[model samples]
Target chain A: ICLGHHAVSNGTKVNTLTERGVEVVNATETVERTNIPRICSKGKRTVDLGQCGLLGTITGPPQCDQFLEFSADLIIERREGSDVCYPGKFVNEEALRQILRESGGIDKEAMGFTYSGIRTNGATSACRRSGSSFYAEMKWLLSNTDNAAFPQMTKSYKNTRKSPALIVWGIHHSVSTAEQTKLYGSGNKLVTVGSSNYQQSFVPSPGARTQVNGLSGRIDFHWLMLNPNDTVTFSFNGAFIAPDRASFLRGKSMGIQSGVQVDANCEGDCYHSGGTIISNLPFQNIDSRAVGKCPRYVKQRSLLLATGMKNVPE
Target chain B: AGFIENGWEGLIDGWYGFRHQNAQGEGTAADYKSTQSAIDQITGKLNRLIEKTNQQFELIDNEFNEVEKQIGNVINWTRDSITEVWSYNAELLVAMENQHTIDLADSEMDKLYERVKRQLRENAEEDGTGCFEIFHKCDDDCMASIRNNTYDHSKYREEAMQN
Candidate 1:
């Protein structure tokens, strides 16, 4: 692993960019280890994160959980059991044989800690679009506290008018109108950032007013269920999960407004979940009965055809 | 003594005789003679009488003028008070009287009359008070003024699309 190559193999360490600009010394090696550390409520344990440049040394079920618990809970709890690309379960059987024996998990370069996934990389993209907006810069949910790389959670100013109260962000944004009014009720401040940019990228564009379609502001459910490859992946719940931990954690949900995810052949989880694809503009509704590119109503027949499932919810 | 022995003529004649009969029993001529002398005595009295009559006429003229001035003042005061109290009522009365027979006989005429009265009165009050003149005719005029003044954001939206 690059972590080992730096400390033991050579006198000169491999300076990897874990965070932008700021160089964190291999502090995981030198940081004091607590005898016992806090564990997740759901029994998620510390997986080998040091090899991935997420942490440094201090081995065996982790000397301290500040690094381990933060990552596991963020990826799992925020998704409501949907797993991130890196690790599935640290507490369960698979982690025991594969992770415990090998000491290190997957190859460091493959995990791409610095490059891909919702890990700070997703936030940087949001900032590019909105110009470091309050809606994009800060975290609104407690689940984000674990992601030290991105905007982490701080105390909610539900009681006092603090600066953080004015600046909060959530990718799994499901905050209600009433809740938002309570949080930031400064005149006409109620805003929603649509994930259609992320959604339409998975499918082809319609035209003209397609950006203003109902799907325009809504995050794509199908895209949330997909990994980076657009392939279907089961969550820790053994149930289909949308990858958007932010939207999921916020409890924001909407039915399929565009049927393009189904057109892209999203069977099983993505189809049954009744979601569409990622980042761009509009997703063309395939079924003639599906009406316009963005229908006011998501049809049962189209949903059935796409996912091979029944009882598409409201 | 001789004038006393005579009657009316004796007094005058006697005074004259008395005057004429001096110590030697001789007499002088009368002091004032004929109409010229009598006019002198009577003219003093006549002047006083005419002056009294003139004074009486001047008093009557003054009283008459005072009466007229008082009446004019009362009339003016009454007019201003009426204007303040029932200026609207006056216009309303004219409007009501001028209403056509078709309108007067209508069942809803009372409501119409009330509405017109209320609106006109409100408008008068509004005009008198220096409030926003937007509501001249009240409904239509007020809305027109507001529609022209208030900004519509849709213009910006349109501009964005054009750009």
Candidate 2:
């Protein structure tokens, strides 16, 4: 059983849900600051996930010129599984080697591996057998071998530390969907084409329209890094998971802009891991301008409606 | 001495030389020519005043009509432009949502650019089927109004003289 939830910007309990009868402790507002990772960004120009390591977490500002951030979390629990438990490792050598070979004849030793498990034939499809199982999917992102900080490469992460690897792991996982997806405009090239801190009018494509349909859509983060030798703009061509088109439309109208906002506090942010529950409806109209022009004279009118943020996963 | 009975009369010459009275005051002009001249002048003055008033009314009506039509034309054009802007913005938003990037095809853009060059003879006419029909239609309305005003003024004069 997995329970998921989200905390407001002030870290107050917004909502919580779980599949099993459980006691949720983080719901208490009077938790310590250190208890939750400071996932908010502090005006960093470069989006370097190097500091965020495997199973570790970091915070970033919701909106910034160099990076875009959101919230997503996952949790799994064993309730009545007696067949056998399979604990997965963080890195797999053979799978990483195959990926490297398919991409090119790139030389590499190992890659970061996360979340691999198997349930086997433990329970009947209907659950009358009274047996149990545990099956979790494995997840990892592609890597850049040159950068000492980039993991997921066989060449050498010679300098990549575990500090911020997991978030980078998540970020790259979401971005790597570019593998099969099409790109136009700044899509193929790395450049500043969308959203500013002042005016967040970012369009992935300037003049054309694109539709992403598949296991996952494309994901990327463009950020400028003030590095030791030279100033660099980092654009991660990562992979992502995608909900159905129907769910995407519903969520968009329902105020969940993107399905891949990853927050560090997994237990608190995982609101609907095992099941689907549409919660939190935040106002989204502020970001989108209405289609008609406004009149010169100011005529006042009041219209009140329900609106707030909706959280979903990629 | 016998003073000619002037009786507030007889100093009058008359109209265009016709006389309504002699030294003796009576209604015996024997013809209505003098009376006819006075009637003509009165009618003429009345006609002028009526025509001036009519002109004022028509001017006000037409001016206001032109204003309303102009506003209508602006409203129409603005609505279309806004629709285009909103539509273009929406396409971009979808791309962003899908995590895809997009750009206009080179050929599509080139065709549009070439269109502005007066590239062909058919489109060179100043009054070609312009994209914004509202502006052109308003211009036609204004021109038709000038022609109608001139014709109507002549008709008013003819009717006034007949009256």
Candidate 3:
């Protein structure tokens, strides 16, 4: 036991290293132990770590859980000077991931903890790899996001114009055409964007958009000549939930539009064709917050992009 | 010191055979064993070098038990002895065969020495698979519990080796 001495030796040649207790001292130095400790310095402990309550093996798999459970006083969203969570739910998820990674990696080192073996030591270890990232997607499934965000998108503006409510059409992703715009009653085929020759019925409103996989640009504007800029925000529940106002430019001009195309291949055939509405740049991605039916085919952006159909000259 | 130490002799060698063997004080011009002579002796089996070789081989093998010095000196000494014995035995056999005087070019003695030394070398050399074999010795459950995935230590050790 070189551990107990200082120079070094086992039962063999005796010189001066620390002796048998070196491991015990090292492990006890961390994680504040009054009763006992885990992973002695030499090798593993002969006894179960569970008896010490350091780990749990019987009930389930080893959980990578945080020690403390933190909850904030308030989660807010704002416009201009007021605190309001906009139409689309944006819940500080990105910042949460960063905080976890930095704090978690440091905490593990401080208490001499390890998971996923030594991804922190070898050539291919986590520490060596510049982008060694591990996170459980700060989102907690469909239940995590706000189901009905911003109770009022339906309010009217002064000298207002809006997308024709008598003809309620829903815009979504489609497997066959990519960007499928369907007249509410028409199943799949009836949903069509009016070509250059025709007067396109539904006005394309464009605004500050963060979700744009292909044919989505902040400059993209649908000019049906209805509604004030930025008044009506689109809060969709699919691959994206961005707030693109009428003033925000999406596609580029009056005809073309800019917006993130939420990938909904798994969510069934919705808007499949004409996804990358530009120069044939393919819309090849899967970026949606939810996974099925209505809300599952939802917002994928860090920002909000949900909108409600407004009948507002009222 | 010389005057004080000298005991009734003109120079140190004057008393008897204990003298500086040469002016520079070491080594004889004699090459006592010829390359061929050593081979003939092995081929002849004038004495049982096999027993001596085997003893040395066993000693080297047991030196692996030296534990503390296991990381260094034991390995070197054992390796050197094994190689030295094989080198003499192998070269001696080849020299005997090439001499072209014996009726059968490949003789029985040479065959025995070759076989014997080959066995000795294999017995002495370390083919890795050593001390850190502890985790493998543990039961499957213990190993599995310690590692979420099975720990193939050779690969794990290779990665951990840098650490």
True contacts kept of each: 0.00, 0.00, 0.00
lDDT of 1 at A130: 31
Query: Weakest 10 consecutive residues, lDDT, candidate 1 chain B?
Result: B14-23
Q: Which stretches of candidate 1 lie over 4 Å from their true place?
A: A1-138, A141-169, A172-175, A186-314, B1-163
| Candidate structures ordered by lDDT, highest first | 1, 3, 2
Give model 3's docking category. Answer: incorrect
lDDT of 2 by residue, A142-212 (tens): 22332222211111112132221111111212223243232211133221211112111122222322333
C-alpha lDDT score of every prediction, in listed order: 0.25, 0.21, 0.24
Consecutive 10-residue window with the lowest summed lDDT within model 3 chain B: B13-22
Error of 2 at A88 (Å): 17
lDDT string for model 3 (A172-223, tens) is: 2232222222211112221122322323223233233454323222211122
Residue A97 alpha-carbon offset, candidate 1, angstroms: 17
Runs in model 2 deviating more than 4 A are A1-314, B1-152, B155-163
Per-model TM-score, in order, reads: 0.13, 0.14, 0.14
RMSD score of candidate 1 (Å): 47.7
Candidate 1 iRMSD, 1 decimal: 64.0
